[PDB]
Design a protein around this ligand. Structure first.
Ligand SMILES: [Mg+2]
Ligand SMILES: [Mg+2]
Ligand SMILES: [Mg+2]
Ligand SMILES: [Mg+2]
Ligand SMILES: [Mg+2]
Ligand SMILES: [Mg+2]
Ligand SMILES: [Mg+2]
Ligand SMILES: [Mg+2]
Ligand SMILES: [Mg+2]
Ligand SMILES: [Mg+2]
Ligand SMILES: [Mg+2]
Ligand SMILES: [Mg+2]
Ligand SMILES: [Mg+2]
Ligand SMILES: [Mg+2]
Ligand SMILES: [Mg+2]
Ligand SMILES: [Mg+2]
Ligand SMILES: [Mg+2]
Ligand SMILES: [Mg+2]
Ligand SMILES: [Mg+2]
Ligand SMILES: [Mg+2]
Ligand SMILES: [Mg+2]
Ligand SMILES: [Mg+2]
Ligand SMILES: [Mg+2]
Ligand SMILES: [Mg+2]
Ligand SMILES: [Mg+2]
Ligand SMILES: [Mg+2]
Ligand SMILES: [Mg+2]
Ligand SMILES: [Mg+2]
Ligand SMILES: [Mg+2]
Ligand SMILES: [Mg+2]
Ligand SMILES: [Mg+2]
Ligand SMILES: [Mg+2]
Ligand SMILES: [Mg+2]
Ligand SMILES: [Mg+2]
Ligand SMILES: [Mg+2]
Ligand SMILES: [Mg+2]
Ligand SMILES: [Zn+2]
Lengths: 272, 64, 95, 117, 87
RNA sequence: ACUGCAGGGGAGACUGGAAUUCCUGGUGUAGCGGUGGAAUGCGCAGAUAUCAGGAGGAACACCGGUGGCGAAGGCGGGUCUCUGGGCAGUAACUGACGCUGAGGAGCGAAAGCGUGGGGAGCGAACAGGAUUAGAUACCCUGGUAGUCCACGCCGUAAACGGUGGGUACUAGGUGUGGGUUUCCUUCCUUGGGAUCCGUGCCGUAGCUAACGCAUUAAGUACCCCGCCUGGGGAGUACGGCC
């Protein structure tokens, strides 16, 4: 579901786009929209901390319910599948049977008009949210929370999923999309299924301006700089940067995780 | 010489794990066709009853 | 309406009292779709020939249903998610 | 300093070597003296004579931990396979039963290519 | 495909006289049913290359009965194409 | 068309056990591995062995054969859903609708190619050891692409029965796979006789340069198709199409 443009211009010679074949109702819900404004990478002091940000197209925040705590046993109905410019996935408008509207990240295979349950008595279908105590082992899940009731934080980009390995006594083991075997609590909640829109990594953005619309501002290499500006800069012709590779602030490459962080007792195996 | 062609309507069944004690050997393996006297069609039904009865654990895959 | 036959292997830490009311909630998905359930024979405890998920015993139930082709593929989807069930082997009877 | 009255002896007899280990019924090794432990090096380790000295050095060192009767699990396509069961007998062990536990795959993993020697 | 109580309704509409299983009207009628039934088996299951060959034996057999029925009577040919379809 | 029947014929989804490898832990301690003989290598920072638990991928022991299926390439762990073809019997139906098929179109082992997953074992390339006058090899220890999955491309094999398809006829002997049917027939023997369809071996007439083929023809005849015209140069060049 990735359409390829014809080479009519020098800037669409290899470009592609999503087919948008799953989006129904091209406008968002009015009451579930909050404003946003770009920062250009600037913090509260007004300085660039994250480089290469800015430009951009104007956006609006869609309120995504990552909690799903307080509607256990009230069934819902998928009204629409929509677009969301903040995330790489697609969002799904659930009409609950009591009257509240919500958005969730759409799992793969959650066409319009389905029914989504929640709580401990739900069925293991794509879309349902259960505690990890009630999911059988081997099931592909997404949008898993780290702490009980703290909000879904793991595996929620497009295509990503966690495999639930096993449950011992009071902790479940999870394979995460980097290979990182993590052990989390079994009262954490997780949505059954794998996140939809799985083909968007294959999109060849065609021209330079098509990344300026998405917000990415150009990245300049350190080796074409001056030695006051970057540790790699200098050299009369062109160089490799006559030292081992570093950041612009002189930090050597290598492991940057805190060596005795508190969550080391929950990590079985680092990624490869 | 074949029991299942001689005595009619005796259903080879994967539930029946007393008929399938014979036609398998002492090591659990399926007996050959020349040592039991079956025809080709009933050796196929015996060897399908045994493979199913190993999956619902009525017979073992191996034994010593 | 094809004649089927379903063999279920239940967990040995369940008594023979909560077996016929247990799968009765599963066999109501056959009756609400138009099927018929004929013979729900229970063999009881039996020594397994090998260890199925840290168990050496098991309860053998034979279902003998006669339903639509899309409701038996629903019945073993729900049995294989219940924690009481170890194995399932759905077999037809006719040719 | 241990004392277990009944044991199990495992004999792995390959085409290059033999290894005789002796365990308890739970599967915990008492003594393991093989054909290279008894002094040999090279192609001599696969002969039947080095098997009947490997089985003696494991038998009379299992008896210092009190083992008086072993069971025998042999596996491997080796030459020294009967000369290591007969060698446990003439060192002071009652053998009882003899079983063959050669790992026989159900055509799973792919073997290495055949030798053009 | 095409159970014995399903081919009777096709023979009652295209057969000639209440027992006709052999005429080119009753055989193009049954073969157009099996071609249409086997194309749903090829929308799902794209890679069934061995049932798709049985489709081309049925297509080639139906086209020879069309060619025969357009040689012996052109009036039967027109009132059979219009009830099923050409192009 | 009706009635029976045999089968690894195909495609999709879920799923089963043995073993190989790695990981966590217990017991254990000094060798394991490999060969014609050795070394490189692994190990002494606790290997090999041995028992328990777990992760993962690929292949499916026995049945399994001289056997079945498919147009050929090929096809076997189990179950379910959809689906192609063949054989026999009845003689109910249409009434020559048949055969072959230039160009054309589809299918077509393995290696390879593109994008994306997966990666246990094996293993082009490659690295080391050995052998050797040398060893870009055989042998040994490692090991990437690849082998696997989804979707496309490629279009080649000693793709072989080195034997194109249809039909009729021309002694038999003996095994075997799939049906149907009379006799001592229920004295069971699933034995014998008859008949249609496959699959083998042996063999007369007949043919062949010989070897050999021989009712599954390379025999006796008819119909359609592709191909050959001394060996090299060469299934190469040039031109074209993909
Ligand atoms: Mg300020
Ligand atoms: Mg950047
Ligand atoms: Mg400069
Ligand atoms: Mg300058
Ligand atoms: Mg400056
Ligand atoms: Mg500097
Ligand atoms: Mg320079
Ligand atoms: Mg410079
Ligand atoms: Mg059968
Ligand atoms: Mg099949
Ligand atoms: Mg496939
Ligand atoms: Mg295993
Ligand atoms: Mg590994
Ligand atoms: Mg260890
Ligand atoms: Mg080990
Ligand atoms: Mg299969
Ligand atoms: Mg007439
Ligand atoms: Mg033709
Ligand atoms: Mg041609
Ligand atoms: Mg092709
Ligand atoms: Mg290939
Ligand atoms: Mg290449
Ligand atoms: Mg590839
Ligand atoms: Mg790749
Ligand atoms: Mg090698
Ligand atoms: Mg070398
Ligand atoms: Mg050729
Ligand atoms: Mg071939
Ligand atoms: Mg040829
Ligand atoms: Mg001919
Ligand atoms: Mg014949
Ligand atoms: Mg011959
Ligand atoms: Mg000739
Ligand atoms: Mg010439
Ligand atoms: Mg050429
Ligand atoms: Mg050219
Ligand atoms: Zn039989």
């Amino acid at each position: 579901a990735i359409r390829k443009y014809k080479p009519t211009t020098p800037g669409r010679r290899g470009a592609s786009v999503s087919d948008f074949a799953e989006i129904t109702r091209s406008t968002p819900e009015k009451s579930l929209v909050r404003p946003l404004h770009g920062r250009g990478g600037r913090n509260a002091h007004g300085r660039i901390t994250t480089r290469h940000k800015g430009g951009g197209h104007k956006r609006a925040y869609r309120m995504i319910d990552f909690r799903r705590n307080d509607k256990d046993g009230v069934n819902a109905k998928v009204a629409h599948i929509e677009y969301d410019p903040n995330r790489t996935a697609r969002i799904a408008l659930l009409h609950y049977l009591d009257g509240e509207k919500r958005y969730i990240i759409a799992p793969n295979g959650l066409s319009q008009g389905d029914v989504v349950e929640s709580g401990a008595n739900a069925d293991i279908k794509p879309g349902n949210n259960l505690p990890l105590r009630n999911i059988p082992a081997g099931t592909l899940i997404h949008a898993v929370e780290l702490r009980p009731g703290g909000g879904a934080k793991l595996a929620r980009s497009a295509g990503s999923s966690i495999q639930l390995l096993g449950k011992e006594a009071s902790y479940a083991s999870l394979r995460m999309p980097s290979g990182e075997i993590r052990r989390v609590d079994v009262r954490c909640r997780a949505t059954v299924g794998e996140v939809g829109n799985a083909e968007q990594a294959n999109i060849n953005w065609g021209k330079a301006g098509r990344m300026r619309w998405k917000g990415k501002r150009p990245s300049v290499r350190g080796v074409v700089m001056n030695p006051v500006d970057h540790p790699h800069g200098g050299g009369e012709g062109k160089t490799s940067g006559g030292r081992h590779p570093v950041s612009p602030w002189g930090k050597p490459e290598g492991r940057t995780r805190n060596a005795n962080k508190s969550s080391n007792k929950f990590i079985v195996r680092r990624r490869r | 010489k074949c029991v299942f062609c001689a005595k009619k309507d005796q259903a080879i069944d994967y539930k029946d794990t007393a008929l399938l004690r014979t036609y398998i050997s002492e090591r659990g393996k399926i007996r050959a066709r020349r040592v039991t006297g079956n025809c080709v069609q009933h050796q196929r039904d015996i060897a399908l009853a045994v493979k199913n009865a190993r999956e619902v654990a009525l017979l073992p895959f191996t034994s010593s | 309406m094809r004649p089927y036959e379903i063999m279920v292997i239940l967990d040995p830490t369940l008594d023979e009292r909560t077996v016929a009311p247990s799968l009765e909630t599963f066999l109501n998905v056959v009756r609400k779709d138009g099927g018929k359930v004929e013979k729900v024979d229970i063999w009881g405890k039996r020594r397994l020939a090998y260890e199925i998920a840290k168990h050496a015993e098991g309860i053998y139930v034979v279902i003998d249903v006669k339903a639509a082709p899309a409701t038996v593929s629903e019945l073993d989807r729900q049995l294989s998610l219940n924690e009481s069930v170890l194995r399932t082997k759905v077999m037809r009877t006719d040719k | 300093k241990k004392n277990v009255p009944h044991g199990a002896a495992h004999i792995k007899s390959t085409f290059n070597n033999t290894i005789v280990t002796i365990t308890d019924p739970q599967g915990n090794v008492i003594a393991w003296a093989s054909s290279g432990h008894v002094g040999f090096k090279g192609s001599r380790k696969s002969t039947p004579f080095a098997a009947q000295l490997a089985a003696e050095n494991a038998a009379r060192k299992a008896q210092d931990h009190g083992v008086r009767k072993v069971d025998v699990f042999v596996k491997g396509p080796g030459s020294g396979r009967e000369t290591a069961i007969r060698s446990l007998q003439a060192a002071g062990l009652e053998v009882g039963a003899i079983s063959d536990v050669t790992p026989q795959p159900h055509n799973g993993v792919r073997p290495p290519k055949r030798r053009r020697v | 495909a095409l159970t014995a109580e399903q081919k009777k309704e096709i023979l009652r509409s295209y057969g000639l006289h209440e027992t006709d299983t052999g005429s080119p009207e009753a055989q193009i009628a049954l073969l157009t049913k099996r071609i249409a039934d086997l194309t749903e088996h090829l929308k799902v299951h794209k890679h069934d290359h061995h049932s798709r060959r049985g489709l081309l034996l049925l297509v080639g057999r139906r086209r020879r009965l069309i060619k025969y029925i357009s040689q012996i009577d052109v009036e039967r040919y027109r009132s059979l194409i219009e009830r099923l379809g050409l192009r």
